[PDB]
Amino acid sequence: CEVQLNIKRNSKHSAWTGELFKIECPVKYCVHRPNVTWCKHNGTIWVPLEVGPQLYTSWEENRSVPVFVLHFKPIHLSDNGSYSCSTNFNSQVINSHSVTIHVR
What we know:
Elements (H helix, E strand, L loop, with lengths): L3 E2 L5 E5 L5 E8 L7 E6 L4 E3 L6 E6 L6 E6 L8 E9 L2 E4 L3 E5 L1
Parallel strand pairs: 2-10
Antiparallel strand pairs: 1-3, 3-7, 4-5, 4-8, 6-7, 8-9, 8-10
């Protein structure tokens, strides 16, 4: 068992502006659940994603593997971009592959 963030490589999804939309980060862990955070690429680097009245997170256990979720309520054109999840757990940084969202 090793803590892993399991977004599939090359993940890509499209959404429509104004829809309630979500992206998911499956998390494999061994004993305690890590504090996971979302990041969004700003064109040159990955930066922590700011949440607020229309962007929030949750954990779903209604599955085989727990899933950390980012919910856009609703999603906007400005949300187009590449996202990943990461965690500082124990003594290292664990990262995931990115999911690219294209908003129409």
